[PDB]
DNA sequence: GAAGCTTC
DNA sequence: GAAGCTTC
């Protein structure tokens, strides 16, 4: 996830 | 190193 | 199935 807790997508 | 997910 | 980057 983000980063951080990519995206999602990318 | 170890945890934090949908979107093509 | 690849398609991704960091907090900690």
């Given at each position: 996830?983000?980063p951080?807790?990519?995206?999602p997508?990318?």
């Amino acid at each position: 996830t983000x980063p951080g807790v990519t995206x999602p997508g990318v």
